[PDB]
């Protein structure tokens, strides 16, 4: 996954679209938190709120398209 490709970009967009529930073009703690809970996984909406508060470039408390596409390409083969 280290090398970029069509799949990769499309992958980021897909994942992004899934999180942006309100569909405002950005992801929020509540938006993701809901997705994390509905899935039945760690509903620690607190952990995210804290993590987002950090990666948040504008400090708006939301994750933009680029950030997600980046923080996801950090590792994982």
């Amino acid at each position: 996954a280290d090398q970029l490709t069509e799949e990769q970009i499309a992958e980021f967009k897909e994942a992004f679209s899934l999180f942006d529930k309100d569909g405002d073009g950005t992801i929020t703690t509540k938006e993701l938190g809901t997705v994390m809970r509905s899935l039945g996984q760690n509903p620690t909406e607190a952990e995210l709120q804290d993590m987002i508060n950090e990666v948040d470039a504008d400090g708006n408390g939301t994750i933009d398209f680029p950030e997600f596409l980046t923080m996801m390409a950090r590792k994982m083969k």
């Binding site: 899934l18 994390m36 509905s38 899935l39 996984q41 952990e47 996801m72």
Partner: peptide
């Protein structure tokens, strides 16, 4: 320490899992 990346990846994996299944 770490855990942020895992949470992000775990959510994506589960999110897609639901997408493939087509549930809800």
């Amino acid at each position: 320490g770490t855990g942020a990346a895992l949470s992000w990846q775990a959510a994506i994996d589960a999110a897609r899992q639901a997408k493939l299944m087509g549930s809800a």
